[PDB]
Design an enzyme around this catalytic site. Structure first.
Site, PDB file in Angstrom:
ATOM      1  N   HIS A   1       0.928  -1.068   0.112  1.00 17.69           N
ATOM      2  CA  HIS A   1       0.034   0.017   0.033  1.00 17.69           C
ATOM      3  C   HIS A   1       1.051   1.332  -0.004  1.00 17.69           C
ATOM      4  O   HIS A   1       2.013   1.022  -0.065  1.00 17.69           O
ATOM      5  CB  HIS A   1      -1.408   0.041   1.199  1.00 17.69           C
ATOM      6  CG  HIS A   1      -0.611  -0.059   2.673  1.00 17.69           C
ATOM      7  ND1 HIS A   1      -0.450  -0.798   3.610  1.00 17.69           N
ATOM      8  CD2 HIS A   1      -0.322   1.628   3.184  1.00 17.69           C
ATOM      9  CE1 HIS A   1      -0.142  -0.027   4.711  1.00 17.69           C
ATOM     10  NE2 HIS A   1      -0.326   1.145   4.490  1.00 17.69           N
ATOM     11  N   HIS A  24       1.431   3.996   2.155  1.00 17.36           N
ATOM     12  CA  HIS A  24       1.949   4.506   3.286  1.00 17.36           C
ATOM     13  C   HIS A  24       3.498   4.423   3.368  1.00 17.36           C
ATOM     14  O   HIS A  24       4.022   3.407   2.881  1.00 17.36           O
ATOM     15  CB  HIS A  24       1.410   3.923   4.466  1.00 17.36           C
ATOM     16  CG  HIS A  24      -0.130   4.376   4.679  1.00 17.36           C
ATOM     17  ND1 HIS A  24      -1.087   3.543   5.527  1.00 17.36           N
ATOM     18  CD2 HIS A  24      -0.605   5.648   4.732  1.00 17.36           C
ATOM     19  CE1 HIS A  24      -2.222   4.370   5.551  1.00 17.36           C
ATOM     20  NE2 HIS A  24      -1.951   5.566   5.272  1.00 17.36           N
ATOM     21  N   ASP A  57       5.509   3.188   5.705  1.00 17.77           N
ATOM     22  CA  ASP A  57       6.013   1.731   5.952  1.00 17.77           C
ATOM     23  C   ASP A  57       6.148   0.731   4.797  1.00 17.77           C
ATOM     24  O   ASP A  57       6.163  -0.530   4.931  1.00 17.77           O
ATOM     25  CB  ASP A  57       5.426   1.215   7.156  1.00 17.77           C
ATOM     26  CG  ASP A  57       3.788   1.267   7.244  1.00 17.77           C
ATOM     27  OD1 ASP A  57       2.909   2.259   6.578  1.00 17.77           O
ATOM     28  OD2 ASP A  57       3.160   0.554   7.889  1.00 17.77           O
ATOM     29  N   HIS A  61      -7.554  -1.129   5.504  1.00 20.72           N
ATOM     30  CA  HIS A  61      -6.778  -0.088   6.268  1.00 20.72           C
ATOM     31  C   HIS A  61      -6.471   1.008   5.459  1.00 20.72           C
ATOM     32  O   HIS A  61      -6.137   2.130   6.006  1.00 20.72           O
ATOM     33  CB  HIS A  61      -5.603  -0.728   6.887  1.00 20.72           C
ATOM     34  CG  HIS A  61      -3.996   0.035   7.034  1.00 20.72           C
ATOM     35  ND1 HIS A  61      -3.944   0.916   8.390  1.00 20.72           N
ATOM     36  CD2 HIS A  61      -3.130   0.277   6.283  1.00 20.72           C
ATOM     37  CE1 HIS A  61      -2.881   1.584   8.144  1.00 20.72           C
ATOM     38  NE2 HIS A  61      -2.356   1.182   7.090  1.00 20.72           N
ATOM     39  N   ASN A  82      -3.615   4.211  13.283  1.00 20.47           N
ATOM     40  CA  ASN A  82      -3.792   5.096  12.478  1.00 20.47           C
ATOM     41  C   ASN A  82      -4.875   4.767  11.298  1.00 20.47           C
ATOM     42  O   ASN A  82      -4.592   4.118  10.394  1.00 20.47           O
ATOM     43  CB  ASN A  82      -2.648   5.930  11.790  1.00 20.47           C
ATOM     44  CG  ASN A  82      -3.033   6.338  10.454  1.00 20.47           C
ATOM     45  OD1 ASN A  82      -3.307   7.507  10.350  1.00 20.47           O
ATOM     46  ND2 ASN A  82      -2.584   5.430   9.260  1.00 20.47           N
TER      47      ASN A  82
HETATM   48  O1  FZX Z   1      -1.496   0.710  12.233  1.00 21.95           O
HETATM   49  C1  FZX Z   1      -0.623   0.637  11.232  1.00 21.95           C
HETATM   50  O2  FZX Z   1      -0.512  -0.157  10.309  1.00 21.95           O
HETATM   51  C2  FZX Z   1       0.705   1.444  11.515  1.00 21.95           C
HETATM   52  N1  FZX Z   1       1.561   1.710  10.557  1.00 21.95           N
HETATM   53  C3  FZX Z   1       2.343   2.663  10.932  1.00 21.95           C
HETATM   54  C4  FZX Z   1       1.961   2.709  12.279  1.00 21.95           C
HETATM   55  N2  FZX Z   1       1.034   2.152  12.568  1.00 21.95           N
HETATM   56  C5  FZX Z   1       0.577   1.975  13.759  1.00 21.95           C
HETATM   57  C6  FZX Z   1       1.059   1.108  14.776  1.00 21.95           C
HETATM   58  C7  FZX Z   1       2.100   0.499  14.451  1.00 21.95           C
HETATM   59  C8  FZX Z   1       2.445  -0.414  15.267  1.00 21.95           C
HETATM   60  C9  FZX Z   1       1.909  -0.636  16.493  1.00 21.95           C
HETATM   61  C10 FZX Z   1       1.115   0.058  16.826  1.00 21.95           C
HETATM   62  C11 FZX Z   1       0.264   1.012  15.988  1.00 21.95           C
HETATM   63 ZN    ZN Z   2      -0.511   1.953   6.470  1.00 30.40          ZN
HETATM   64 ZN    ZN Z   3       1.410   0.158   9.112  1.00 29.53          ZN
END
Ligand code: FZX
Ligand code: ZN
Ligand code: ZN
Ligand code: ZN
Length: 231
Positions: free
Chosen positions: A83, A85, A87, A148, A179
């Site tokens: 996706h 984002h 990460d 998501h 998020n």
């Molecule tokens: O929710 C996600 O996929 C995410 N990506 C980046 C940050 N997050 C939140 C998150 C990431 C790890 C633990 C708790 C919450």
């Molecule tokens: Zn994401």
């Molecule tokens: Zn994520």
């Protein structure tokens, strides 16, 4: 034992072999105050490797592409971003500079550009509507629908019955939802059902973040999604 975030110095990256020719990669990044780990996948494709999602950022990704060389010692040739984002596309520049051909649905490229994130070069056709599927080397590429993010994809390795869910699946540890800024809360549980149907045989389930589990990771996530819906 699987790596926990308390043992990965920033900019470092560990691996974890699930199966013969299937690894995950594990990085960290810090975000306003805290530390969060991120999972990707590495799939052996004969004598090449196929990488699923970056290690969350240029530096981490540069590092991940060094650990692979030392530990597995094969070349990463094609890369898919599940996706838009950071990460997932975070490090696409690095990979492509390093000979990796980079991929993403046209849906993901469009949201990455709008967001301003780094944009995979090639376009994956044929996953515009759910519950679409196409084959890509040692894996199948699945569009369950919005969850998501509206573009999110999921990955299956038949050879080893490994399903990688990305951030559209949570680990059990995760009881509250994250998020969901770009989420389709409306359709997220529906879209998980499509997953459950398309891969009932899946033995290892790996979420975008944290501890793997089995297919009961899906019901976990649906529960946390709906809880948040009524919040
Ligand atoms: O929710 C996600 O996929 C995410 N990506 C980046 C940050 N997050 C939140 C998150 C990431 C790890 C633990 C708790 C919450
Ligand atoms: Zn994401
Ligand atoms: Zn994520
Ligand atoms: Zn649960």
């Amino acid at each position: 034992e699987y790596p926990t975030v308390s043992e990965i110095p920033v900019g470092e990256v560990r691996l974890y072999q699930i199966a013969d020719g299937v690894w995950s990669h594990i990085a960290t990044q810090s975000f306003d105050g805290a530390v969060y780990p991120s999972n990707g996948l590495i799939v052996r494709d004969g004598d090449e490797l196929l990488l699923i999602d970056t290690a969350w950022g240029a530096k981490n990704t540069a590092a991940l592409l060094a650990e692979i060389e030392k530990q597995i010692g094969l070349p990463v040739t094609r890369a898919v971003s599940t996706h838009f984002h950071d990460d997932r596309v975070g490090g696409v520049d690095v990979l492509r500079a390093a000979g990796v051909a980079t991929y993403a649905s046209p849906s993901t490229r469009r949201l990455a550009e709008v967001e301003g994130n780094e944009i995979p070069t090639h376009s994956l056709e044929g996953l515009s509507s759910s519950g679409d599927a196409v084959r890509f080397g040692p894996v199948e590429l699945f569009y369950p629908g919005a969850a998501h993010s509206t573009d999110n994809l999921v990955v299956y390795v038949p050879s080893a019955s490994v399903l990688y869910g990305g951030c559209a699946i949570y680990e059990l540890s995760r009881t509250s939802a994250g998020n969901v800024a770009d989420a389709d809360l409306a359709e997220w549980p529906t879209s998980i059902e499509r997953i459950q149907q398309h891969y009932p045989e899946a033995q290892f389930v790996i979420p975008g973040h944290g501890l793997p589990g089995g297919l009961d990771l899906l019901k976990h996530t649906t529960n946390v999604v709906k809880a948040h819906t009524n919040r």
